[PDB]
Amino acid sequence: HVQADHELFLQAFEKPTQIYRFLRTRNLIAPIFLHRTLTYMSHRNSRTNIKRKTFKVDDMLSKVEKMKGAHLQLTFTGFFHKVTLEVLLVKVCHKKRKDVSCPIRQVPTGKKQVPLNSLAVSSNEFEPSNSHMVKSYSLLFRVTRFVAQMTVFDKNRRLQLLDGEYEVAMQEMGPTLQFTLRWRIFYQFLYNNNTRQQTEARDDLHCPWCTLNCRKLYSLLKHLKLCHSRFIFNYVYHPARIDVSINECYDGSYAGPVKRTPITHILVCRPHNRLYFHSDTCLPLRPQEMEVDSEDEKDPEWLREKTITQIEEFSDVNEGEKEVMKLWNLHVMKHGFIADNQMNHACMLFVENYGQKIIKKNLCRNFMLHLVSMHDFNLISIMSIDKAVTKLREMQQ
């Protein structure tokens, strides 16, 4: 498994799944239709219509009528001074017309013994009465063996102090006190008829991306078939096989004041393989010969004939010179040479490829002249030329 096709295995299964990863969040936060209401997936519903017989919407007000028929757990804490303790709520009222001073009333809730160096319950004991007479309300926490207030409730019936522990100072007429308030499937992937991956499902029937807990295999096959339809699902009982395959004919498209024409659609009332052609001939290519005889290699003969007729058209070149020229052209075209050092081998191939041709035409002198000519361009060493021509005249002799 190379990384490219393995990344294509991810990428080919990513972009359909990534839209489904988006539609998963969209369908959960904004469902299209309730999954319980499907006929093929109906086990999710777990109720009947028995209660509608004895029901009455005129009597619904009677049902809610009989329905119509904060728990500040201010717990004390360890004191810090140098026993018993008590809390109290101080109510401040508004300035009335007759009375000039504010009404004052200290309501002690309850005591509790705590060490230094228990709890007290208060289940919504504001007692403001909503009569436009409770201007403010404080909560004191006294100690002994050390008293102060702390704004717990705000003006608008809001929570001022946070949860957790806390501490406070004290002032008579050092000592202090504390408190603590409390309010099996198997996804057999197959793409291009290639087993890119073979897995086994973790859970039995938990869908791979929708993640619904269906207690039946027929519901899972129909859900994957109907919903999430970028793939074509085919499954056979064989521990269960699920043959996932990308739908390469899916209708990915738009598919859905201003003028437009009317229509009437009704749905329910009562329920590689394409042919090929040759390059130069354009004849139909048989499936038997596709990989064998790969065209576009083994460069064509018209280029060779062009190299022949071009230098043959040259006026101021001799016969044997043109002969060795076409021989060198056919040699370099039959075996392309890009590197310059490989040319040192190329002459050693030339006598090993066409030496018998130059002996049969008496072209050794102009061959050595061509060797010296390429030597002028600093392509090859002179001792290599000595070796090559000695080998050539050895095989010729």
């Binding site: 040759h278 001939t281 004849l283 018209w302 004939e305």
Partner: protein, 365 residues
């Protein structure tokens, strides 16, 4: 000399579609004494036709393809080697070359290797199995219908640089001329060892025995080219022994040959450039493209049409081509442009087509 030809219009048929015809051909391969037969073609309507002494052109067969947009161009006749049956060969604008067997009345064979329209079809005269095809795609092709495969492609980098309009073998079947819109009259050859062993290997081809493709022997190098015989388009070319006859939109036929007058045809090099204009035939009113001429089997005469209707006939047995006695033929009803004419095996019957869906006939007397 006098005309020596008592021509008279024996029949003038008109088809019921009103579409310009593009070709007509007689069954030269038929034997002697049998009832003669020829075939015309429109855009999407090929029609075989009999002919009698009293002008009774008995309608024999008429095929039409499903796709109406196809535009047929030319037709040809051939005889089978084994079954010894007739075979019509047709083509059109769809890039298709169909072979109709008139006895069974079916499309027994069809070939497709071109990109665009077919201009003209020809068959090798000696060996009846080969089949040359000219097309607008700047290249020719050569097929073998006995083995159902392609033989060769007479085109390439050195081929015509424009639409190829026509081509023709010689009478012996050893050298082919070709012409088109590129102002070039290019020669080919089917006599070298390469084309011979290629045809021989094509005869021995069988896709069921072996599993290989066919080695198509392309030809990217014609043996002679020239761009001075004409200036306008060259619509048709034919052989006369070892002489090239050619037309053009200049309203003049030209008879010539490559090289000097003493240079032999079978020793012309690729770099040969000189030519020799042997003679010319004059006429007028041939501006419209896709015009043709024709000859008989013996090639004793020559027929030609014009874009008005007054057709022309020239002699070939007599000497002095540029001083040859011409001949005209007119009528008070041929108010259309003639595209092609044709003769039977003998020079008795002449049949011509036109652009008004008309088919005219003439006969000696």
């Amino acid at each position: 000399k006098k005309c020596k030809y008592s021509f008279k219009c024996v029949n003038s048929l008109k088809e019921d579609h009103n579409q310009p015809l593009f070709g007509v051909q007689f069954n030269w391969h038929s034997k002697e004494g049998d009832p003669l037969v020829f075939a015309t073609v429109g855009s999407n309507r090929v029609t075989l036709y009999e002919c009698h002494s009293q002008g009774e052109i008995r309608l024999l067969q008429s095929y039409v393809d499903a796709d109406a947009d196809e535009n047929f161009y030319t037709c040809a006749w051939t005889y089978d080697s084994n079954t010894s049956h007739p075979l019509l060969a047709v083509a059109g604008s769809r890039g298709i070359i169909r072979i109709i067997n008139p006895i069974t009345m079916q499309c027994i064979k069809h070939y497709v290797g071109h990109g665009n329209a077919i201009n003209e079809l020809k068959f090798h005269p000696r060996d009846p199995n080969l089949l040359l095809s000219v097309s607008k795609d700047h290249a020719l092709r050569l097929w073998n219908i006995q083995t159902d495969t392609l033989v060769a492609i007479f085109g390439g980098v050195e081929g015509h640089r424009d639409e190829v309009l026509s081509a023709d073998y010689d009478l012996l079947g050893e050298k082919i001329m070709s012409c088109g819109m590129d102002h070039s009259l290019k020669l080919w050859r089917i006599n070298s060892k390469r084309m011979m062993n290629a045809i021989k290997e094509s005869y021995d081809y069988n896709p069921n025995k072996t599993n290989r493709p066919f080695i198509s022997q392309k030809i990217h190098f014609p043996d002679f080219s020239t761009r001075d015989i004409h200036r306008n388009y060259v619509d048709c070319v034919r052989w006369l022994g070892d002489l090239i006859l050619s037309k053009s939109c200049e309203n003049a036929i030209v008879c010539w040959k490559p090289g000097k007058m003493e240079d032999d045809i079978d020793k012309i090099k690729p770099s040969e450039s000189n030519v020799t204009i042997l003679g010319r035939f004059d006429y007028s009113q041939c501006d419209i493209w896709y015009m043709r001429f024709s000859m008989d089997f013996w090639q004793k005469m020559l027929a030609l049409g014009n874009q008005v209707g007054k057709l022309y006939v020239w002699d070939l047995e007599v000497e002095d081509p540029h001083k040859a006695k011409c001949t005209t033929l007119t009528h008070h009803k041929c108010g259309a442009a003639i595209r092609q004419t044709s003769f039977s095996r003998d020079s008795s019957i002449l049949i011509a087509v036109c652009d008004d869906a008309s088919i005219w006939r003439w006969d000696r007397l």
